[PDB]
Amino acid sequence: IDPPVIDAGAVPPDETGPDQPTEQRKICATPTVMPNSNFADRPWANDYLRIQEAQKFATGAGVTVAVIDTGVNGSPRVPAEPGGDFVDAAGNGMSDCDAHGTMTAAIIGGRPSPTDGFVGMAPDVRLLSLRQTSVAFQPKGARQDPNDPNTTQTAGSIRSLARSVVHAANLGAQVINISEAACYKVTRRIDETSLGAAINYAVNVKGAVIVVAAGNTGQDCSQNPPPAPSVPSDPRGWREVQTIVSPAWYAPLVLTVGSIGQNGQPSNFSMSGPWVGAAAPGENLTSLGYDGQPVNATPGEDGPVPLNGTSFSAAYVSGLAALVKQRFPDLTPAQIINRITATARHPGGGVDNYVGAGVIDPVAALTWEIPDGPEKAPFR
Numbered sequence: 323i324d325p326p327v328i329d330a331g332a333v334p335p336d337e338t339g340p341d342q343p344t345e346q347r348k349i350c351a352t353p354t355v356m357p358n359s360n361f362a363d364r365p366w367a368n369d370y371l372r373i374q375e376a377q378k379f380a381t382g383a384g385v386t387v388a389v390i391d392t393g394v395n396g397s398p399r400v401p402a403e404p405g406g407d408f409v410d411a412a413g414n415g416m417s418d419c420d421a422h423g424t425m426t427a428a429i430i431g432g433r434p435s436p437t438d439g440f441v442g443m444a445p446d447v448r449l450l451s452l453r454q455t456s457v458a459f460q461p462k463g464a465r466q467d468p469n470d471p472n473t474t475q476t477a478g479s480i481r482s483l484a485r486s487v488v489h490a491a492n493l494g495a496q497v498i499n500i501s502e503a504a505c506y507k508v509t510r511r512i513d514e515t516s517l518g519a520a521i522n523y524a525v526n527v528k529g530a531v532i533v534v535a536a537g538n539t540g541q542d543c544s545q546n547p548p549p550a551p552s553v554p555s556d557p558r559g560w561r562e563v564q565t566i567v568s569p570a571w572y573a574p575l576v577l578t579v580g581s582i583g584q585n586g587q588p589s590n591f592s593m594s595g596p597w598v599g600a601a602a603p604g605e606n607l608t609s610l611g612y613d614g615q616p617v618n619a620t621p622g623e624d625g626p627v628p629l630n631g632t633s634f635s636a637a638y639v640s641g642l643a644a645l646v647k648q649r650f651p652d653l654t655p656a657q658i659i660n661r662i663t664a665t666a667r668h669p670g671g672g673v674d675n676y677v678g679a680g681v682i683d684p685v686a687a688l689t690w691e692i693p694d695g696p697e698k699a700p701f702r
Contacts, residue, residue, distance in 0.1 A: 323508050323560060323561075323563050323566070324560065324702075325560070325571070325597075325702055326514065326518055326568075326571055326572060326702070327518070327702040328518035328519060328521070328522050328572075328575075328701055328702065329515045329518060329519055330519060330522055330523075331519065332515040332516050332518075332519035333488060333516070333519045333520060333522075333523045334481070334484045334485050334488060334516040334519070334520055335485070335488075336485070336488050336489055336492050337485055337489075338406040338407060338408055338485070338489065339407070339408060339411050339482075340408055340409050340410070340411065340461070340478075340482055341461075341478035341479070341481045341482040342461045342462075342463055342478055343411065343461070343462055343463065344409055344410060344411075344456075344459045344460055344461055344462060345459070345460065345461075345462035346458060346459055347457070347458060347459065347460050348457060348458045349458070350419035350420075350458055351419065351420055351421040351458065351620060351621070352421055352611070352612065352621070353421045353424070353425065353609075353611040353612070353617040353619065353620050353629075354617060354619045354620065354621055354626050355616075355617055355618055355619055355626065356618050356619045356626050356628060357626075359608075359616075359618055361438040361439060361440060361608065361616040361618075362438060362439055363439050364439045364440075365439070365440060365607065365608035366584050366603070366606065367429075367602075367603035367607060367608075367638065368439070368440075368441065370584075370586075370603055371443075371602070371603065371638065371682065371683075371684050372683075372684060372685050373441065373443060373684065374441075375684075375685050376443075376642075376645060376684035376685050376687075376688055377441075377445070377645075379645070379649055379685075379688040379689065380444070380644075380645035380646070380648040380649040380688055381444060381445055381446035381645070381648065382431060382443075382444025382445065382446045382447035382641065382644035382645055382647075382648055383446035383447075383648055384446075384648055384651075385444065385446075385448070385496050385497065385644040385647045385648055386447065386448040386449075386450060386493075386494055386495050386496055386497075387430050387431060387444070387447045387448070387449055387450070387495060387496070387497040387498070387499060387640055387641075387643075387644050388405060388450040388451075388452060388490035388493065388497070388498045388499065388530075389402065389405075389423060389426055389427045389430065389449060389450065389451050389452065389499050389501075389637075389640075390452045390454045390483070390486050390487070390490060390498060390499060390500045390501060390502065391422060391423030391426045391427070391451070391452075391453070391454070391455065391499070391501040391633065392418055392419070392420035392421075392422040392423035392453060392455055392456050392457075392501070393407070393409075393413075393415050393416065393417045393418040393419065393420070393423045393424075393451055393453035393456075394415065394416060394418050394423045394424045394426075394427045394449070394451035395416070395417065395418040395424045395611075395612035396416055396424075396451070397610070397612065397613050397614030398433070398614055399428070399432055399435065399610055399614030400424060400427050400428045400431070400432055400433075400449070400614050401433075401449065402415075402416065402427050402449040402450065402451040403416075403448065403449065403450055403451070404416050404450075404451065405450035405451050405452035405489070405490060405493055405495075406452050406453070406486070406489055407452075407453045408452065408453060408454040408482045408483075408485060408486045408489075409453050409454065409455065409456045409459050409482075410453075410459060413453060415450075415451040415452045415453040416451055417453070418453075418612065419456060419458040419459065420455075420456050420457055420458050421611075421620050422501070422633070423451060423453065423501070424609075424610070424611060424612055425607075425609035425610065425611070425617065425629060425634070426499065426501055426609075426633055426634060426637045427449050427451060428440075428442055428609040428610035428614075429442055429443065429607070429609050429634055429637040429638060429641065430442055430443060430444060430447065430449065430499060430637045430638075430640050430641045430644070431443075431444050431445060431446075431447040431448075431449045431641065431644070432445065432609065432610045432614075433445050433614075435614075438616050440608055440609070440610060440616045442641055443637075443638055443640075443641025443642055443644070443645065443684070444641040444642075444644040444645050444648075447497075447641075447644045450490065450493055450495055452486045452489060452490055454479075454482055454483055454486045454502060455479060455501065455502050460475070461475055461478060471506070471510045471511060471512050471513075472512055472513050474506070474512070476504045476505070476506050476512060476542070477512040477513070479502060479504050480504050480512060480514055480516075480517050480568060481516055481517070483500065483502055483504070483517060483520075483569065484514075484516040484517040484519070484520040485516075485520070487500070487517070487520040487521060487523075487524050487532070488520045488523060488524065490524065490530070491520075491523060491524035491527075491528035491530050492528070495530055496529070496530055496531065496644070496647055497530065497531045497532075497533065497640050497643045497644050497647065498524060498530050498531070498532045498533070498640075499533050499534075499633075499636055499637055499640035500532065500533070500534040500535065500569055500576075500636070501535050501633035501636065502534075502535070502569070503534070503535045503536065503537030503538070503543070503567050503568075503569075503570055503593065503632065503633075504567070504568045504569075505537055505542055505543035505544075505565050505566065505567050505568075505593070506565070506566055506568075507564065507565065507566075508563055508564055508565065511566075512568075514568055517568065517569060518572065521569060521572050521575055521576060522575065522701070525575055525576070525655050525699075526575075526698060529654065529655060530655060531577070531640075531643045531647070531655040531658050531659060532569075532575070532576040532577070532655070533576065533577045533579060533636050533639045533640040533643055534569050534570055534572075534576050534577070534578050534579065534636055535570070535578075535579060535631070535632035535633040535635065535636045536567065536570055536578050536579055536580040536581070536592055536593045536594075536595070536598050536632045536635070536636075537567040537570055537592075537593035537632055538581075538591045538592070538593065538630075538631055538632055539590075539591045539592075539593060540591075543565065543567070543593060544564065544565050545565075545593065545594060546559070546562070546563055546564055546565055546593065546594045546595050546675065547559065547562045547564065548562070548594070548675060549562060549596075549675065550562055558596030558673075558675060559596055559675060560596045563595060563596065565593070565595075567593050567595055567597070570593070570595060570597050570598070571595065571597040572597070572701075573597035573598070573599045573678075574599060574656075574659065574699045574700075575699050575701050577599045577600060577639060577643075577659045577662065577663070578595075578597050578598050578599045578600075578678065579598075579599070579600050579601060579602055579632060579635045579638075579639045579678075580592040580593070580594070580598050580600070580601040580604075580632055580635060580676055580677050580678065581601065581602070581603070581604025581605065581630070581631065581632045581634075581635040582601050582602065582603060582604065582605075582635075582677065582681055583603075583604070583605040583606070584603075584605065584606060586681065588601065588676040588677055589604055589605050589630070589632075591630065591631075591632075592604065592632055592635075592676060593632065594675040594676045595675055596675060598674075598675055598676065598677065598678040599659075599663055599678035599679055600639055600662060600663055600666055600677065600678045600679050600680065600681070600682055601635065601666075601676070601677035601678060601680060601681045601682070602635040602636070602638035602639050602681060602682050603634075603635065603638060604630060604631055604632055604634050604635035605628070605630045606618075606628045606629070606630070607628070607629040607630070607634050608629070609629060609634070617629075638682065639662065639682055642662060642682055642684050642687055643658055643659075643662065645684065645687075645688060646658050646661055646662065646688065649688055653694065654697045654698065655699075656695070656696060656697060656698050656699040657694050657695055657696075657697065659699070660692075660694070660695040661687050661690075661692065662682055662687050663678070663679035663680075664679070664690075664692050664695075665682075665683050665686035665687045665690050665692070666678075666679045666680035666681060666682050666683055666687075667680040667681045667682075667683055668680040
Protein backbone atom coordinates (compact mmCIF):
# COMPACT_ATOMS: atom_id res chain seq x y z
CA ILE A 323 0.00 0.00 0.00
CA ASP A 324 0.96 3.64 -0.61
CA PRO A 325 -0.15 6.80 1.17
CA PRO A 326 -3.67 7.67 -0.02
CA VAL A 327 -4.16 10.10 -2.91
CA ILE A 328 -6.88 12.75 -2.78
CA ASP A 329 -9.51 13.46 -5.44
CA ALA A 330 -10.03 17.16 -4.71
CA GLY A 331 -13.19 17.13 -6.83
CA ALA A 332 -15.14 14.49 -4.91
CA VAL A 333 -16.30 16.70 -1.99
CA PRO A 334 -19.60 15.26 -0.71
CA PRO A 335 -22.71 17.41 -0.28
CA ASP A 336 -23.19 19.27 2.99
CA GLU A 337 -26.01 17.04 4.25
CA THR A 338 -26.72 15.45 7.62
CA GLY A 339 -28.05 12.00 8.42
CA PRO A 340 -26.66 8.44 8.38
CA ASP A 341 -25.30 6.68 5.29
CA GLN A 342 -28.04 4.05 5.75
CA PRO A 343 -31.07 3.94 8.08
CA THR A 344 -30.26 2.94 11.67
CA GLU A 345 -32.05 1.20 14.56
CA GLN A 346 -31.27 0.89 18.27
CA ARG A 347 -29.22 -2.12 19.42
CA LYS A 348 -28.48 -1.29 23.07
CA ILE A 349 -29.88 0.79 25.91
CA CYS A 350 -28.42 4.31 26.11
CA ALA A 351 -25.35 4.38 28.36
CA THR A 352 -24.40 6.62 31.32
CA PRO A 353 -20.86 7.22 32.63
CA THR A 354 -19.98 6.49 36.24
CA VAL A 355 -17.09 6.56 38.72
CA MET A 356 -14.43 4.17 39.93
CA PRO A 357 -14.77 3.47 43.65
CA ASN A 358 -12.50 5.58 45.89
CA SER A 359 -11.92 8.25 43.28
CA ASN A 360 -10.67 11.65 44.39
CA PHE A 361 -11.76 14.41 42.04
CA ALA A 362 -10.29 17.19 44.15
CA ASP A 363 -6.85 16.13 42.86
CA ARG A 364 -5.87 17.18 39.34
CA PRO A 365 -6.38 14.41 36.77
CA TRP A 366 -2.97 12.83 36.08
CA ALA A 367 -3.17 14.12 32.50
CA ASN A 368 -3.45 17.74 33.70
CA ASP A 369 -0.26 17.38 35.70
CA TYR A 370 1.56 15.40 33.02
CA LEU A 371 0.74 17.92 30.29
CA ARG A 372 1.23 20.97 32.56
CA ILE A 373 -2.22 22.23 31.56
CA GLN A 374 -2.35 24.86 34.32
CA GLU A 375 0.98 26.34 33.24
CA ALA A 376 -0.06 26.19 29.57
CA GLN A 377 -3.28 28.09 30.35
CA LYS A 378 -1.22 31.10 31.44
CA PHE A 379 -0.64 31.63 27.70
CA ALA A 380 -4.02 30.72 26.16
CA THR A 381 -7.44 29.33 27.05
CA GLY A 382 -8.91 28.80 23.60
CA ALA A 383 -10.97 32.00 23.73
CA GLY A 384 -12.40 32.90 20.31
CA VAL A 385 -11.80 29.41 18.89
CA THR A 386 -14.52 26.93 17.85
CA VAL A 387 -13.80 23.20 18.10
CA ALA A 388 -15.99 20.62 16.36
CA VAL A 389 -16.29 17.30 18.17
CA ILE A 390 -17.15 14.53 15.72
CA ASP A 391 -18.07 11.71 18.10
CA THR A 392 -21.14 10.06 19.72
CA GLY A 393 -22.98 13.31 20.50
CA VAL A 394 -22.78 15.41 23.65
CA ASN A 395 -25.13 15.72 26.60
CA GLY A 396 -24.41 19.37 27.27
CA SER A 397 -24.19 21.25 30.55
CA PRO A 398 -22.82 24.58 31.79
CA ARG A 399 -19.35 23.03 32.12
CA VAL A 400 -19.58 21.30 28.72
CA PRO A 401 -21.61 23.89 26.83
CA ALA A 402 -21.59 22.22 23.39
CA GLU A 403 -23.81 23.57 20.62
CA PRO A 404 -25.69 21.45 18.05
CA GLY A 405 -23.68 20.52 14.97
CA GLY A 406 -25.90 17.85 13.48
CA ASP A 407 -26.65 14.13 13.59
CA PHE A 408 -25.18 11.61 11.19
CA VAL A 409 -26.48 8.55 13.01
CA ASP A 410 -30.20 9.26 13.42
CA ALA A 411 -32.25 10.74 10.57
CA ALA A 412 -33.60 13.32 13.01
CA GLY A 413 -31.26 14.82 15.57
CA ASN A 414 -28.85 17.67 16.25
CA GLY A 415 -25.82 16.07 17.89
CA MET A 416 -26.80 17.04 21.43
CA SER A 417 -27.83 13.54 22.48
CA ASP A 418 -25.09 11.23 23.78
CA CYS A 419 -26.49 7.72 23.98
CA ASP A 420 -23.04 6.14 24.18
CA ALA A 421 -21.33 7.90 27.10
CA HIS A 422 -18.35 8.99 25.05
CA GLY A 423 -18.71 12.22 23.09
CA THR A 424 -19.61 14.10 26.25
CA MET A 425 -16.30 13.13 27.85
CA THR A 426 -14.37 13.91 24.68
CA ALA A 427 -15.84 17.39 24.55
CA ALA A 428 -15.05 17.97 28.22
CA ILE A 429 -11.38 17.02 27.82
CA ILE A 430 -11.20 19.58 24.99
CA GLY A 431 -13.14 22.44 26.53
CA GLY A 432 -14.59 21.48 29.90
CA ARG A 433 -14.88 24.43 32.28
CA PRO A 434 -13.29 24.45 35.77
CA SER A 435 -15.26 24.19 39.05
CA PRO A 436 -14.73 25.47 42.61
CA THR A 437 -15.58 21.95 43.82
CA ASP A 438 -13.16 19.74 41.85
CA GLY A 439 -9.78 19.71 40.13
CA PHE A 440 -11.00 18.93 36.61
CA VAL A 441 -10.52 21.35 33.72
CA GLY A 442 -10.34 20.78 29.96
CA MET A 443 -7.31 21.77 27.90
CA ALA A 444 -9.01 24.81 26.40
CA PRO A 445 -11.84 25.89 28.75
CA ASP A 446 -12.87 28.99 26.77
CA VAL A 447 -13.52 27.30 23.41
CA ARG A 448 -16.90 27.10 21.76
CA LEU A 449 -17.82 23.45 21.27
CA LEU A 450 -19.83 22.11 18.33
CA SER A 451 -21.12 18.55 18.61
CA LEU A 452 -21.69 16.40 15.54
CA ARG A 453 -22.85 12.86 16.25
CA GLN A 454 -21.23 10.61 13.65
CA THR A 455 -20.70 7.31 15.46
CA SER A 456 -22.67 5.19 17.90
CA VAL A 457 -22.75 1.67 19.26
CA ALA A 458 -26.25 2.08 20.68
CA PHE A 459 -27.56 2.86 17.18
CA GLN A 460 -26.46 0.86 14.13
CA PRO A 461 -27.47 0.28 10.47
CA LYS A 462 -30.58 -1.89 10.33
CA GLY A 463 -30.42 -3.24 6.76
CA ALA A 464 -28.59 -6.44 5.83
CA ARG A 465 -25.85 -6.20 3.18
CA GLN A 466 -27.11 -7.59 -0.12
CA ASP A 467 -23.58 -8.60 -1.21
CA PRO A 468 -21.08 -9.80 1.43
CA ASN A 469 -18.26 -9.36 -1.11
CA ASP A 470 -18.66 -5.61 -1.72
CA PRO A 471 -16.24 -3.69 0.52
CA ASN A 472 -18.30 -0.53 0.03
CA THR A 473 -21.41 -1.92 1.74
CA THR A 474 -19.66 -2.79 5.00
CA GLN A 475 -20.54 -0.78 8.10
CA THR A 476 -16.99 0.57 8.00
CA ALA A 477 -17.47 2.03 4.50
CA GLY A 478 -20.78 3.60 5.55
CA SER A 479 -19.15 5.31 8.51
CA ILE A 480 -16.36 6.60 6.23
CA ARG A 481 -18.96 8.12 3.89
CA SER A 482 -20.98 9.73 6.70
CA LEU A 483 -17.75 10.97 8.30
CA ALA A 484 -16.90 12.71 5.01
CA ARG A 485 -20.18 14.64 5.16
CA SER A 486 -19.70 15.55 8.84
CA VAL A 487 -16.26 16.96 8.08
CA VAL A 488 -17.66 19.18 5.31
CA HIS A 489 -20.50 20.13 7.67
CA ALA A 490 -18.14 21.03 10.54
CA ALA A 491 -15.92 23.05 8.22
CA ASN A 492 -18.94 24.97 6.93
CA LEU A 493 -20.20 25.66 10.46
CA GLY A 494 -16.96 27.55 11.00
CA ALA A 495 -14.96 25.14 13.12
CA GLN A 496 -11.24 26.01 13.31
CA VAL A 497 -10.34 22.73 14.97
CA ILE A 498 -12.05 19.42 14.22
CA ASN A 499 -11.66 16.40 16.52
CA ILE A 500 -12.49 13.07 14.85
CA SER A 501 -12.98 10.15 17.20
CA GLU A 502 -13.73 7.62 14.47
CA ALA A 503 -10.97 5.26 13.37
CA ALA A 504 -12.38 3.09 10.59
CA CYS A 505 -10.19 -0.02 10.23
CA TYR A 506 -10.09 -2.41 7.30
CA LYS A 507 -7.70 -4.98 5.81
CA VAL A 508 -5.26 -3.70 3.15
CA THR A 509 -6.55 -6.50 0.93
CA ARG A 510 -10.14 -5.21 1.07
CA ARG A 511 -9.98 -1.56 0.09
CA ILE A 512 -12.92 0.77 0.54
CA ASP A 513 -13.61 3.72 -1.78
CA GLU A 514 -12.70 6.64 0.48
CA THR A 515 -12.63 9.29 -2.24
CA SER A 516 -15.36 11.39 -0.62
CA LEU A 517 -13.48 11.36 2.70
CA GLY A 518 -10.10 12.40 1.30
CA ALA A 519 -11.91 15.17 -0.59
CA ALA A 520 -13.80 16.31 2.52
CA ILE A 521 -10.54 16.49 4.47
CA ASN A 522 -8.78 18.51 1.76
CA TYR A 523 -11.79 20.83 1.65
CA ALA A 524 -11.90 21.33 5.42
CA VAL A 525 -8.16 21.89 5.79
CA ASN A 526 -7.11 23.56 2.56
CA VAL A 527 -10.28 25.46 1.63
CA LYS A 528 -11.78 26.21 5.06
CA GLY A 529 -8.51 26.35 7.01
CA ALA A 530 -9.41 23.89 9.79
CA VAL A 531 -6.93 21.89 11.90
CA ILE A 532 -8.09 18.27 11.91
CA VAL A 533 -6.92 16.02 14.78
CA VAL A 534 -7.86 12.33 14.65
CA ALA A 535 -7.70 9.24 16.88
CA ALA A 536 -5.05 6.68 15.88
CA GLY A 537 -7.59 3.98 16.66
CA ASN A 538 -7.91 1.34 19.37
CA THR A 539 -7.24 -2.37 18.89
CA GLY A 540 -10.26 -4.62 19.26
CA GLN A 541 -12.49 -6.75 17.10
CA ASP A 542 -12.03 -5.60 13.46
CA CYS A 543 -8.98 -3.48 14.36
CA SER A 544 -5.78 -5.55 14.36
CA GLN A 545 -2.40 -4.10 15.38
CA ASN A 546 0.04 -3.25 12.58
CA PRO A 547 3.48 -4.86 12.54
CA PRO A 548 6.49 -2.61 13.19
CA PRO A 549 8.79 -1.38 10.40
CA ALA A 550 11.27 -3.94 9.05
CA PRO A 551 14.78 -2.63 9.89
CA SER A 552 16.26 -4.21 6.72
CA VAL A 553 14.25 -1.99 4.34
CA PRO A 554 15.79 1.53 4.66
CA SER A 555 13.63 2.74 1.76
CA ASP A 556 10.59 2.11 3.97
CA PRO A 557 11.50 3.33 7.47
CA ARG A 558 7.87 3.80 8.59
CA GLY A 559 6.88 0.37 7.28
CA TRP A 560 4.25 1.36 4.71
CA ARG A 561 4.89 -1.97 2.98
CA GLU A 562 4.31 -3.83 6.26
CA VAL A 563 0.83 -2.39 6.89
CA GLN A 564 -1.94 -4.98 7.29
CA THR A 565 -4.68 -2.70 8.63
CA ILE A 566 -5.60 0.66 7.18
CA VAL A 567 -6.93 3.14 9.72
CA SER A 568 -8.92 6.07 8.32
CA PRO A 569 -8.93 9.05 8.58
CA ALA A 570 -5.71 8.35 10.53
CA TRP A 571 -3.82 7.57 7.34
CA TYR A 572 -4.33 11.07 5.87
CA ALA A 573 -1.42 12.33 7.94
CA PRO A 574 0.07 14.85 7.73
CA LEU A 575 -2.97 16.64 6.28
CA VAL A 576 -4.57 15.61 9.57
CA LEU A 577 -2.76 15.07 12.87
CA THR A 578 -3.16 11.45 13.99
CA VAL A 579 -2.83 10.93 17.74
CA GLY A 580 -1.93 7.76 19.62
CA SER A 581 -2.29 7.04 23.33
CA ILE A 582 0.18 6.84 26.22
CA GLY A 583 -0.44 5.71 29.79
CA GLN A 584 0.65 7.26 33.10
CA ASN A 585 4.14 5.78 32.79
CA GLY A 586 4.53 7.76 29.56
CA GLN A 587 4.70 4.57 27.49
CA PRO A 588 2.51 3.81 24.42
CA SER A 589 -0.79 2.17 25.40
CA ASN A 590 -1.07 -1.43 24.27
CA PHE A 591 -4.40 -0.68 22.59
CA SER A 592 -3.11 2.23 20.55
CA MET A 593 -3.13 1.43 16.82
CA SER A 594 0.31 1.82 15.28
CA GLY A 595 1.02 2.86 11.71
CA PRO A 596 3.28 4.88 9.42
CA TRP A 597 0.79 7.75 9.65
CA VAL A 598 0.81 8.30 13.42
CA GLY A 599 1.94 11.87 14.17
CA ALA A 600 1.70 12.52 17.92
CA ALA A 601 0.52 11.08 21.24
CA ALA A 602 -1.25 12.16 24.43
CA PRO A 603 -2.68 10.69 27.65
CA GLY A 604 -5.30 8.06 26.84
CA GLU A 605 -5.59 5.79 29.89
CA ASN A 606 -7.27 6.05 33.28
CA LEU A 607 -8.60 9.48 32.40
CA THR A 608 -11.06 11.82 34.15
CA SER A 609 -13.61 13.92 32.34
CA LEU A 610 -17.12 15.30 32.87
CA GLY A 611 -20.45 13.49 32.56
CA TYR A 612 -23.95 14.49 31.48
CA ASP A 613 -24.41 17.10 34.22
CA GLY A 614 -20.88 18.49 33.93
CA GLN A 615 -19.81 16.49 36.98
CA PRO A 616 -16.50 14.57 37.14
CA VAL A 617 -16.61 10.98 35.88
CA ASN A 618 -13.85 8.47 35.29
CA ALA A 619 -15.53 5.24 34.24
CA THR A 620 -18.26 3.62 32.22
CA PRO A 621 -20.26 0.65 33.55
CA GLY A 622 -18.98 -2.86 32.95
CA GLU A 623 -20.02 -6.47 33.54
CA ASP A 624 -17.36 -7.08 36.21
CA GLY A 625 -17.28 -3.52 37.50
CA PRO A 626 -16.68 0.00 36.26
CA VAL A 627 -14.10 0.38 33.46
CA PRO A 628 -11.68 3.36 33.37
CA LEU A 629 -11.80 5.96 30.60
CA ASN A 630 -9.34 4.86 27.91
CA GLY A 631 -8.99 5.50 24.20
CA THR A 632 -7.15 7.26 21.43
CA SER A 633 -10.17 9.51 20.91
CA PHE A 634 -9.50 11.04 24.31
CA SER A 635 -5.82 11.34 23.32
CA ALA A 636 -6.92 13.21 20.20
CA ALA A 637 -9.12 15.43 22.38
CA TYR A 638 -6.11 16.67 24.35
CA VAL A 639 -4.36 17.53 21.11
CA SER A 640 -7.48 19.23 19.74
CA GLY A 641 -7.56 21.33 22.92
CA LEU A 642 -3.91 22.21 22.38
CA ALA A 643 -4.56 23.15 18.74
CA ALA A 644 -7.21 25.52 20.07
CA LEU A 645 -4.73 27.04 22.53
CA VAL A 646 -2.13 27.46 19.78
CA LYS A 647 -4.80 28.94 17.51
CA GLN A 648 -5.67 31.61 20.06
CA ARG A 649 -2.06 32.49 20.77
CA PHE A 650 -0.92 32.38 17.16
CA PRO A 651 -4.02 33.27 15.16
CA ASP A 652 -2.36 33.77 11.73
CA LEU A 653 -0.85 30.28 11.52
CA THR A 654 -2.36 27.92 8.96
CA PRO A 655 -3.43 24.38 9.97
CA ALA A 656 -0.15 22.91 8.75
CA GLN A 657 1.75 25.51 10.78
CA ILE A 658 -0.30 24.81 13.91
CA ILE A 659 0.31 21.07 13.51
CA ASN A 660 4.02 21.82 12.97
CA ARG A 661 4.24 23.72 16.27
CA ILE A 662 2.55 20.82 18.03
CA THR A 663 4.74 18.11 16.51
CA ALA A 664 8.06 20.02 16.57
CA THR A 665 7.78 20.77 20.30
CA ALA A 666 6.61 17.28 21.21
CA ARG A 667 8.62 14.93 23.44
CA HIS A 668 10.22 12.97 20.59
CA PRO A 669 10.81 9.20 20.92
CA GLY A 670 14.02 7.35 20.05
CA GLY A 671 14.64 7.66 16.31
CA GLY A 672 12.81 10.99 16.21
CA VAL A 673 9.48 9.50 15.14
CA ASP A 674 7.87 6.09 15.44
CA ASN A 675 4.69 4.28 14.49
CA TYR A 676 3.34 4.33 18.03
CA VAL A 677 3.61 7.94 19.18
CA GLY A 678 4.63 9.64 15.94
CA ALA A 679 6.63 12.76 16.78
CA GLY A 680 6.00 12.05 20.45
CA VAL A 681 3.85 13.11 23.38
CA ILE A 682 2.59 16.69 23.07
CA ASP A 683 4.12 19.37 25.30
CA PRO A 684 1.56 22.20 25.60
CA VAL A 685 3.89 24.70 27.30
CA ALA A 686 6.61 24.23 24.70
CA ALA A 687 4.01 24.36 21.93
CA LEU A 688 2.85 27.78 23.20
CA THR A 689 6.27 29.31 24.00
CA TRP A 690 9.14 27.92 21.87
CA GLU A 691 10.35 30.12 19.06
CA ILE A 692 10.67 27.95 15.95
CA PRO A 693 10.52 28.46 12.18
CA ASP A 694 6.85 28.52 11.10
CA GLY A 695 7.43 26.13 8.21
CA PRO A 696 5.32 25.89 5.03
CA GLU A 697 1.74 27.14 4.95
CA LYS A 698 0.36 23.90 3.54
CA ALA A 699 1.20 20.23 4.07
CA PRO A 700 2.34 18.13 1.09
CA PHE A 701 -0.34 15.71 -0.11
CA ARG A 702 -0.61 13.28 -3.03
